[PDB]
Write a protein that binds this DNA or RNA. Structure first.
Length: 51
RNA sequence: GGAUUGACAGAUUGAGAGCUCUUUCUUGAUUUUGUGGGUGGUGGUGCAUGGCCGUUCUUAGUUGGUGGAGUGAUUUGUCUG
């Protein structure tokens, strides 16, 4: 239950909740929307400059 | 269509222990809940024990086989100098 799919008609999908440009990962781990911060969960402090 | 785990920051806390709360993120069969059953315990019992030690005892004492005495417990042997 992670309802951030953003699937449209046409059979096109793009990703809600813009995700991490993590060097550790292949850009699959999703960031996390808080106030004054968007937060990575795998590397639990990476890429935190505000929205 | 998720068992569960972990986490920046803020509150919080002596304490960048998220322990617990807000925000959501992270991981994904290992765990988690209950039952039985275990493990651990510088917890009790030293009067339930082992082992070790100390002491009786820095002394010269202890024992039995065959015989003898004695109904016997026991004694002689292990002695008078």
């Amino acid at each position: 239950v992670l309802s951030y799919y953003k699937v449209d008609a046409e059979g096109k999908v793009t990703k809600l909740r813009r995700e991490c440009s993590n060097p550790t990962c292949g850009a699959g781990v999703f960031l996390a929307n808080h106030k004054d911060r968007l937060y990575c969960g795998k590397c639990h402090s990476v890429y935190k400059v505000n929205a």
